[PDB]
Amino acid sequence: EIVMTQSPAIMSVSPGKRATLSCRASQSVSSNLAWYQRKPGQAPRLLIYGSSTRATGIPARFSGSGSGTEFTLTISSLQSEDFAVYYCLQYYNWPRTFGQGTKVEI
Amino acid sequence: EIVMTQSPAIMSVSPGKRATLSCRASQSVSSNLAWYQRKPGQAPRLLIYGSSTRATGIPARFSGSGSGTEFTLTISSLQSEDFAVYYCLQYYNWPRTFGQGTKVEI
Amino acid sequence: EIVMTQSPAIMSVSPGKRATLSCRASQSVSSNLAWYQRKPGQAPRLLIYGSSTRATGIPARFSGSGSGTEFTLTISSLQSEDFAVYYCLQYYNWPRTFGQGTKVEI
Amino acid sequence: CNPNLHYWTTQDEGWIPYFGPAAEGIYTEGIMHNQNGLICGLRQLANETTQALQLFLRATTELRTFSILNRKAIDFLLQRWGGTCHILGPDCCIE
Amino acid sequence: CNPNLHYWTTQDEGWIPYFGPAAEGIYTEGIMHNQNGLICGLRQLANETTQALQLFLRATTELRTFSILNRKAIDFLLQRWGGTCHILGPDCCIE
Amino acid sequence: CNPNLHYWTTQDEGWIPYFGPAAEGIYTEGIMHNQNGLICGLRQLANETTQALQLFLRATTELRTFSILNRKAIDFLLQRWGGTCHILGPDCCIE
Amino acid sequence: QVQLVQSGAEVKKPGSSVKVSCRASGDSFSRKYGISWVRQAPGQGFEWMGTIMPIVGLTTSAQKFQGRVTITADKSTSTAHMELNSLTSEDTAIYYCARDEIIGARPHWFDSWGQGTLVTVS
Amino acid sequence: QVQLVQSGAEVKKPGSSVKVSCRASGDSFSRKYGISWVRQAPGQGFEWMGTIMPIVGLTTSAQKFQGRVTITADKSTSTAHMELNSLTSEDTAIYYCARDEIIGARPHWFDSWGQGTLVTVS
Amino acid sequence: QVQLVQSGAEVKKPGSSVKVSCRASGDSFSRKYGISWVRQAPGQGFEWMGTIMPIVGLTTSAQKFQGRVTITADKSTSTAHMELNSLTSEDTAIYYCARDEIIGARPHWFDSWGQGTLVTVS
Amino acid sequence: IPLGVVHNNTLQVSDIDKLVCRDKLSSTSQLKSVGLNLEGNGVATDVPTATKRWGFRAGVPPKVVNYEAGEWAENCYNLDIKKADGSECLPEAPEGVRGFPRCRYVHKVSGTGPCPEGYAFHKEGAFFLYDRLASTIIYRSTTFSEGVVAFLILPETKKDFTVTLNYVADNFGTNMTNFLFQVDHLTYVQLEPRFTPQFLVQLNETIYTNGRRSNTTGTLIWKVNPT
Amino acid sequence: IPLGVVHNNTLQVSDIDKLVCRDKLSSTSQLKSVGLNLEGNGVATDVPTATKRWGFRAGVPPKVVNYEAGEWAENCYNLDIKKADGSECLPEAPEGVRGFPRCRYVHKVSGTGPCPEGYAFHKEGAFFLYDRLASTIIYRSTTFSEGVVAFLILPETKKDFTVTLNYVADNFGTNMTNFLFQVDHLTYVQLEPRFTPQFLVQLNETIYTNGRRSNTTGTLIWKVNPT
Amino acid sequence: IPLGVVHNNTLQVSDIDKLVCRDKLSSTSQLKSVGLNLEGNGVATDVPTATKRWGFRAGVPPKVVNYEAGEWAENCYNLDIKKADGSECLPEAPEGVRGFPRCRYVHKVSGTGPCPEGYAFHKEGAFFLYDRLASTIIYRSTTFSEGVVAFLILPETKKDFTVTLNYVADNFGTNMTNFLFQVDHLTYVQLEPRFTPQFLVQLNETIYTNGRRSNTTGTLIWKVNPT
Ligand SMILES: *[C@@H]1O[C@H](CO)[C@@H](O[C@@H]2O[C@H](CO)[C@@H](O[C@@H]3O[C@H](CO[C@H]4O[C@H](CO)[C@@H](O)[C@H](O)[C@@H]4O)[C@@H](O)[C@H](O[C@H]4O[C@H](CO)[C@@H](O)[C@H](O)[C@@H]4O)[C@@H]3O)[C@H](O)[C@H]2NC(C)=O)[C@H](O)[C@H]1NC(C)=O
Ligand SMILES: *[C@@H]1O[C@H](CO)[C@@H](O[C@@H]2O[C@H](CO)[C@@H](O[C@@H]3O[C@H](CO[C@H]4O[C@H](CO)[C@@H](O)[C@H](O)[C@@H]4O)[C@@H](O)[C@H](O[C@H]4O[C@H](CO)[C@@H](O)[C@H](O)[C@@H]4O)[C@@H]3O)[C@H](O)[C@H]2NC(C)=O)[C@H](O)[C@H]1NC(C)=O
Ligand SMILES: *[C@@H]1O[C@H](CO)[C@@H](O[C@@H]2O[C@H](CO)[C@@H](O[C@@H]3O[C@H](CO[C@H]4O[C@H](CO)[C@@H](O)[C@H](O)[C@@H]4O)[C@@H](O)[C@H](O[C@H]4O[C@H](CO)[C@@H](O)[C@H](O)[C@@H]4O)[C@@H]3O)[C@H](O)[C@H]2NC(C)=O)[C@H](O)[C@H]1NC(C)=O
Ligand SMILES: *[C@@H]1O[C@H](CO)[C@@H](O[C@@H]2O[C@H](CO)[C@@H](O)[C@H](O)[C@H]2NC(C)=O)[C@H](O)[C@H]1NC(C)=O
Ligand SMILES: *[C@@H]1O[C@H](CO)[C@@H](O[C@@H]2O[C@H](CO)[C@@H](O)[C@H](O)[C@H]2NC(C)=O)[C@H](O)[C@H]1NC(C)=O
Ligand SMILES: *[C@@H]1O[C@H](CO)[C@@H](O[C@@H]2O[C@H](CO)[C@@H](O)[C@H](O)[C@H]2NC(C)=O)[C@H](O)[C@H]1NC(C)=O
Ligand SMILES: *[C@@H]1O[C@H](CO)[C@@H](O)[C@H](O)[C@H]1NC(C)=O
Ligand SMILES: *[C@@H]1O[C@H](CO)[C@@H](O)[C@H](O)[C@H]1NC(C)=O
Ligand SMILES: *[C@@H]1O[C@H](CO)[C@@H](O)[C@H](O)[C@H]1NC(C)=O
């Protein structure tokens, strides 16, 4: 069993600015996390997994790092096409958990 | 084996006043003590035993209480008929012991 | 195995004065030491052994005492005939050891 | 009664303690089938004996039992010779 | 010699380890009297045997002795047949 | 084969546990010479037996062996009487 | 990954059952990925329900659905199925299928996820 | 309790013996109470000497009187007796009998006590 | 003690051997004293080389001379001998004999010591 | 304890006290004791079944017997289960006692439960078979099979008569034991008494067909689809 | 070790090496060893008497023997006495050794004294009888009786051949032991060798006829009136 | 295991399974087992020699046998050597096991070395002879001799069939052991395999002819002049 939070619930990112998602686990799992991009009405797409490794087809703008319980995910130059809810998923133990996602607004 | 002292050797009690006998054991025995009234030339009579329980035929004026090593015996409204030596007997172990008694004078 | 030092390398003793040799072992051996008188070009002669016990034929002027690691050897009224190098030998363990000797000059 | 017997025994047919097959190469094995009912019959015999054996053990102080086969040999001999034999009799097994 | 014997023995006449009388219902008992001197005589025999037994034990390395009765049976048989029998002789116990 | 034997044995010929020679005065000793080669021959027998004995032990679970001499006595008797004897035969050792 | 294909949305009377299915592509996925399901109740994220490993025919699920949701699949078509029995108002959710690398009991995730479908009551 | 009855006082020459007795009433006391004795030397309180339990015929006494005072009783009359042997000046005392609930080796006391009697020398 | 008598001094070519000897007096010394030797290199004190106990015919020596100096004696004449093999410039020393009370492995010393003799090379 | 005799490859049983003159015993080597496995009769060998045939009693000493030969076991057990309070449910094996050496599948069982005092005795009084010996009780961490012992008299004749499945117990015998089959220390499959030793291995082979052991704390218990 | 034989209900003793053709032994079941109690001869069984017949020696190993049947004991002992320095005066019983199970009165003895090194051996070399076994020494806290062992050959015939008194030792054997009879942990009666097991019980029954155990530290020792 | 028979003071060996009608066995007392010493054949008995004939193996249980009589030993050993890591190289002797009681010179050996796991078994499979028993392994601190066991059948006949040398081991068996002979705790003589038990005593007698033990830390090792 694992626990993850949501932070911020909403982030304000003018397009062209760097967006930040803050993932804070109750466990030392920064190497067993996954981040997803969910556009409204759409399925979430894996961006990054483990720690910083990018998923297939993901732009270099998507990056992040962490240690122990915390990981920071960022999106450089976030564009109109990227105004998605970003979720912190923790896959380390069973049951698996998640944050409720960070909405991004202009 | 048990040890008991004498205190006071003599007490001054005008009749009608409350008399006090102080029993100080070397053992935690306030529940295994006995008090006796000995008129000059007479056999001692049990007044109280154990702690506060009265002996048969003893007036309510005779009372007392204690804990551990000490017990205080008192006689409310001591009368002419009560100018007796009062003894602290400790019956807890063998050999048994006693104080040497408190004389009461007017 | 034992260790002994040299002290002083040279001592100045006008004849008639008391000479002093200082023996400092690394071991608690003042009872297992020996002192020798070595005239230039001559074999060393035992003066004292153990602690203070004198060797056969040795004048009373030769004396000393000590405890644990240190022993002080002295020669009362040192004469012309006594201007010898005096050695601190320690014989307590094997290999045995020695100081390099104290030369005496007028 | 599974009629196919895979058995193993002590390999004592026919050696130095620190120059030998540890204490592992001390077993031998092979296969027998239920010829004439021998496998099934043996199992039934072994089943009945459970009771005989538990009483035997309850009745003694021996902690690890080694005496049974030798004890049986002793009684076997006593049955043939129970301190006496009748050469002219029908009951000493003499030809 | 108190002539009234109250004896007990092992109850082995004629059973599952956790479905049985623990290890307590394993004794049986009864009464015998000194008929023809059997009780007194047995006690005297038992008294003499103390010496025989202490030497027996001093002479061995067996720590808990179980071998005596079987050893006696072996010698009993050897006395009847000490590797040989004379059928025509006076000393093999043959009828 | 050193022909001079200095031997010792158990002093069991012919006693109270705290009134006796501790457990030290339990040995006896003497001297034999190699008469007719008995000392040399015995040593060679003892040497051959090393193998026989190591296999014997590998094959069992007995931890301290006491059974060998008795087992031999049992087989000795069985060889004379292996459940049967032929009085008229050449092979029962009967005079 | 595979194309995740989900069935149409529906409304049942409370107490009724819904058979939820996802006929996703991928035969090889029977040995490479678990079939996983979540219940995304309104206002909630992707609550885990359970997962299937068709090569073994082994399944597991959350305590929240014991006695309520059957988790299974048609191994020959790689169609995931769930039986949402005794469906209630609290089960209003978008149900989704996804492919998570075989789990065992070690850390794992999916790269792809379906669109899902709404299941509700009254 | 019982009526405690004591014998008359006397003076002996030092070294003489005195048989002290108390023919108190109470047959039932043989099982309910111990017969106890003390030596109240002048200036002293009731120094313990010993006690008797007639139903058993069991007795006990202080080390101070070992070899000096015999403690016994006539069970049929419930008469307590003591033998004060080799009596000396230090034994001047009023000797008393009393009834203490059976002692065993647990806490106990008497409710009644006799008048006692003087025993002395020269 | 004994009169310690030593052989004459000599110079060898480096690599040569020198047989050093001391025909000291004293027969009784074979059981009472060890025969000891030192190497007094210039600027140094009496560096220990080894010792002999003729009554046993037992010897011991310093690690510095293992494989280099043979330590022995003629028991019948009480003559001490050493074989200074493969002699070098570093072995320039006055070699001396002395009598140390039998050592065993306990504390011991000599009272007397010889004059010694010089052994060197080139 | 009757002695069976094999005569003309036929098993006959002789009366113990009969003068059976047809029986010829020239050597003690003709007398053998054989340990047989409780597999011969088709009895189920799974874990719940084994647990259900064991129980405890205090106040009864253990007993040990020796044997010469025995049957090969398809299945055997090795129990090392702890008591709920942390103490062992089973005694130490005595010196010289080793587990049964001739077994294809061993069901090694651990975990915990509220074990009573006394010894782990067999319910039907069967013996636990160990290396050339047998006993009335189960010893901790020692491999054994269940069985019976027959005694035979042989004529002179020349007859001569692996994997580990890891299981974890839970409440050991209190109505049911919630056994888990261990795949790895994190991966478990809840045990169901339909799975044979072979099915368990095949299920384990399938799990690692596309996998391996990794590292940490997933602690997930899987169920089999009942189909 | 002679073997007695019972013939026509008469005990006769056969020479060990004699060809006694009257003796017929068809089964080992006819050979029995019997443990007899040292009560049969009228020997006193009280506590001081038992103490006086025991002693010690080091450098002598203990020995153990087995038996089949024995006599019922009126009296037996259970000794667990500590040494003055706090160590035990007696060794632990070996596994499988249990005390004598067939006794009416057991004299359980504890307390302390200056016990020598060595084993607690019987003075006359009698054996201590335990549960179907006997030995040359006393084991701590194990019930035993004293006795001897006879060996018999029987014809075929069908013959088949409680309270605790607590005592406290003081200086255990050094001239005398000042034994006390314990009534309760506070109440003692000094022991005198006139009191039989029955008298001790009757004295205990009388004490509690009008009483009970209570609580604390009276520590009083009573003597009996000698009458 | 053949049985030798002594007939007319001549040793003959009988076939085990032969009907040897010349052999008359009236009592089990005629059957004896004898422990013989490995001295009879002239084998060297010094310390390096003994070390070189010993070795180790794990996975093999020890075995023990009993014997009745044996040969007197000129030489025996008592080994108590520690492992380089401080643990013992040898097991504890079992209860009832005592060292060989009939020996003139015992070579008591201690010191340390890198001892392997397993038991200290004899290289040729000879038995270690102990007090009326023998075994396949060496026990810590127990005196033993090396030997073999013969089994004999006797006719009725009446036949009936000290100092410590202290040594210190160094690296115990790794190519060589640098053994020292201890004279006292400070005085050592390096051991050389030319010195017999007698020479070692004579050398020790000579050392103390004009001496005694004293006190402290000299720690000096002496060599013998090779002459
Ligand atoms: C010698 O060979 C015989 C066969 O010839 C063996 O006989 C076995 O004996 C045991 C003990 O009686 C039998 O076990 C019992 O079976 C009862 C019936 O079970 C039926 O239903 C179950 C499903 O619930 C099926 O699996 C089973 O096959 C049957 O159809 C059970 O009711 C018994 O349990 C009850 O009693 C026990 C004991 O008191 C309690 O602990 C239980 O809680 C419960 O109340 C029990 O399980 C077994 O079936 C017999 N086998 C055969 C083939 O007949 C001998 O055991 C064997 N001897 C030796 C030494 O091995
Ligand atoms: C087989 O059966 C016989 C009887 O037929 C038993 O014989 C007993 O043997 C013992 C040992 O000798 C006897 O005990 C000794 O008695 C001596 C005499 O005591 C008398 O005085 C006392 C009172 O002081 C009375 O109680 C007693 O009845 C006698 O009237 C004592 O002096 C002995 O003690 C001395 O020696 C021992 C041992 O060295 C020392 O420790 C003592 O300190 C002291 O110096 C001893 O007590 C016993 O009396 C005999 N009984 C009978 C009936 O004769 C065998 O013992 C029995 N065998 C077996 C194995 O049980
Ligand atoms: C029954 O009686 C016979 C004699 O009749 C005994 O025979 C002995 O058997 C052993 C084992 O083979 C022999 O020991 C071996 O000797 C070889 C030869 O050594 C020669 O050189 C040495 C000096 O280096 C001399 O001391 C010696 O006397 C010989 O001249 C060695 O080479 C062997 O060592 C090699 O093998 C062993 C084992 O694998 C390795 O550990 C070694 O490192 C090395 O590789 C070995 O030492 C012995 O010599 C025989 N004695 C006689 C008189 O012939 C039986 O042993 C005896 N049986 C019993 C049970 O006691
Ligand atoms: C279950 O499967 C695993 C993997 O196929 C087996 O574990 C391997 O065992 C070998 C031999 O001990 C090791 O060298 C490997 O490293 C192990 N691999 C893994 C992933 O664990 C295991 O033995 C199988 N279980 C059974 C009963 O067969
Ligand atoms: C001595 O008398 C007492 C009391 O009559 C007995 O002790 C009782 O024993 C029973 C059974 O164990 C207990 O239930 C009671 O509570 C005990 N009562 C008291 C007051 O102790 C004691 O057993 C008797 N001793 C002997 C040897 O018979
Ligand atoms: C070696 O010699 C010494 C001395 O001669 C022997 O040691 C003596 O042993 C006796 C008996 O134990 C003691 O009382 C002496 O005090 C000891 N003396 C010294 C100086 O140690 C030693 O036993 C001899 N060794 C051998 C094997 O004979
Ligand atoms: C099985 O359950 C019943 C009902 O609760 C209970 O009485 C019984 O004791 C249980 N069995 C065990 C072994 O506890
Ligand atoms: C008994 O007393 C005497 C005299 O004091 C004494 O010599 C003897 O050793 C004592 N007995 C014991 C067992 O100590
Ligand atoms: C002996 O030395 C050789 C060469 O170094 C080495 O290979 C061998 O293992 C050594 N012997 C032992 C017992 O270690």
Author numbering:
A (entry chain J), B (entry chain L), C (entry chain K): 1 to 106
D (entry chain D), E (entry chain F), F (entry chain E): 511 to 524, 531 to 611
G (entry chain G), H (entry chain I), I (entry chain H): 1 to 35, 35A, 36 to 52, 52A, 53 to 82, 82A, 82B, 82C, ...
J (entry chain A), K (entry chain C), L (entry chain B): 33 to 193, 215 to 280
From the paper:
To determine the structural basis of neutralization and synergy behind glycan cap antibody-based enhancement of base-region-binding antibodies, we solved eight structures of glycan cap antibodies in complex with mucin deleted (ΔMuc) EBOV GP (Makona) and BDBV GPΔMuc. All glycan cap antibodies make contacts exclusively within GP1 and are heavily biased toward heavy-chain (HC) contacts. Through molecular mimicry, the CDRH3 or CDRH2 loops of each of the neutralizing glycan cap antibodies characterized in this study bury analogous hydrophobic residues in the cradle, displacing the anchor.
Alternatively, BDBV-43 and EBOV-293 use shorter CDRH2 loops to pair with β17. Use of IGHV1–69 imparts a germline-encoded CDRH2 with several hydrophobic residues that is used by BDBV-43 and EBOV-293 to bind to the MLD cradle. BDBV-43 and EBOV-293 also have much shorter CDRH3 loops, which may be a consequence of their use of CDRH2 to bind the MLD cradle. However, it is possible that contact with CDRH3 loops by germline-encoded, bulky hydrophobic residues rather than strict use of IGHV1–69 is the key feature in selection of germline genes for this class of neutralizing antibodies. Therefore, BDBV-43 and EBOV-293 alternatively utilize their CDRH2 to access this epitope, which subsequently undergoes a large degree of SHM. Comparatively, antibodies that do not use their CDRH2 to access the MLD anchor have much lower SHM in this loop. Conversely, EBOV-293, EBOV-289, BDBV-329, and BDBV-43 only partially contact this pocket and also exhibit lower or no trimer instability.
